[PDB]
Structures are given as structure tokens and as C-alpha cells.
């Protein structure tokens, strides 16, 4: 069935959606990230990272501190429920995670951790 979604990050520092719905009948969910545009990873790299709303800021801040060589994400970050690699234009990456990780009474957010991008590149991921 449909327990997957295609997300795009472009040269204008924007995702093509700020809301993803995960049907409760899904046991696992897949996000397929692509990067239309022409800019390379260093100027406009994008990733897809999922965490609780409360942990978002910490994940973003520590991600920047980790550096481009670590795809701007702190290694073994226990706050990260799902993540794709950092990609440049023309590249792609997919990630699958267990829906059981979406704890009851928690609001999940998806965002890009490349320095400054989360200002525009964010969205809600809700289970229903
Ligand atoms: Cu980005």
C-alpha cells in the first residue's frame, strides 16, 4: 500500500511539502528524498531528519557543529528517529523506519540540518 512519500529539496532552500501523513496501518514508512536543481552539496546540501518537536533544535544545533563531513548530523544521536544522507543536486537517498517509533502523544517534525536550512525546511509528520 502507500506507506511511502517522495520529498524534494531544491536550490531555493525549500522542501515540496511541510506535512506528511502516516497511516496508522503502516508498520514501516519510507521517505524518498531527491534534490532538483543544480547546486552542489556544499552550497545547498539537503537531508531528511526526523525527531520529536522538543528535540529538533538540539539536533539541528549539534548537526551544524558536527560538520559537512558528518553530513551535518551528530553521530549516534539518540534523538534522531530517521535520517537520510546529505545529498546534492542530482543525487537521491531513501530511509525506512518503524512506525512504532512514533510515540503516542508526541508531535514529530522533519527538517534539514544543513546550516540555516531548517528556517524554511521543516514540516510536521503525523500519525493517523
Ligand atoms: Cu537543506
The domain limits of the chain are: 1-128
Whole-number Å distance between alpha carbons of 1 and 107: 24
Phi, psi at residue 59, to the nearest 5°?
-65, -40
Exposed / middle / buried, residue 118 (Cβ in 10 Å: 0-12, 13-18, 19+): buried
Whole-number Å distance between alpha carbons of 40 and 62: 22
Burial 71-99 (b: 16+ CB within 10 A, else e): bbbbeebeebbbbbbbbbbeeebebebee
Q: Is 56 annotated as a binding residue?
A: no
Q: CA end-to-end span of the chain, whole Å?
A: 15
CATH superfamily, domain at 1-128: Cupredoxins -  blue copper proteins (2.60.40.420)
Residue 43 Cα, ligand 1 centroid: separation in angstroms? 9
Residue 121 Cα, ligand 1 centroid: separation in angstroms? 7
CA neighbours within 13 Å on the CB side: how many for 8? 9
Cβ < 5 A residues, ion ligand 1: 46, 112, 114, 117
Of 6, 8, 14, the residue nearest 121 (C-alpha): 14
Beta bridge partners of residue 29, listed in sequence order = 97
Q: In what order do the strands lie in the sheet with 49-52?
A: 19-22, 122-127, 108-111, 49-52, 82-83
Residue 62 Cα, ligand 1 centroid: separation in angstroms? 15
54, three cell numbers: 522538543
The answer to whether the CB of 109 falls within 8 A of the CB of 56 is yes
The answer to whether the CB of 44 falls within 8 A of the CB of 13 is yes
Q: Is 64 annotated as a binding residue?
A: no
Of 41, 40, 44, 21, the residue nearest 31 (C-alpha): 21
3-state secondary structure the chain: CCCEEEEEECCCCCECCCEEEECCCCCEEEEEEECCCCCCHHHHCECCEEEEHHHHHHHHHHHHHHCHHHCCCCCCCCCCCEECCCECCCCEEEEEEEHHHCCCCCCEEEECCCCCHHHCCEEEEEEC
Exposed / middle / buried, residue 59 (Cβ in 10 Å: 0-12, 13-18, 19+): buried
Q: Is 121 annotated as a binding residue?
A: yes
101, three cell numbers: 517509533
Q: Is 35 annotated as a binding residue?
A: no
Q: How was this structure determined?
A: X-ray
Amino acid at each position: 500500500a502507500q506507506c511511502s512519500v517522495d520529498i524534494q529539496g531544491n536550490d531555493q532552500m525549500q522542501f515540496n511539502t511541510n506535512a506528511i501523513t502516516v497511516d496508522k496501518s503502516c508498520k514501516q514508512f519510507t521517505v524518498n528524498l531527491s534534490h532538483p536543481g543544480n547546486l552542489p552539496k556544499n552550497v545547498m546540501g539537503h537531508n531528511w531528519v526526523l525527531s520529536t518537536a522538543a528535540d529538533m533544535q538540539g539536533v539541528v544545533t549539534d548537526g551544524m557543529a558536527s560538520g559537512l563531513d558528518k553530513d551535518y548530523l551528530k553521530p549516534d544521536d539518540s534523538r534522531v528517529i530517521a535520517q537520510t544522507k546529505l545529498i546534492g543536486s542530482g543525487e537521491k537517498d531513501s530511509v525506512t523506519f518503524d512506525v512504532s517509533k512514533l510515540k503516542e502523544g508526541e508531535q514529530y517534525m522533519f527538517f534539514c540540518t544543513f546550516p540555516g536550512h531548517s528556517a524554511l525546511m521543516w514540516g510536521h509528520l503525523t500519525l493517523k
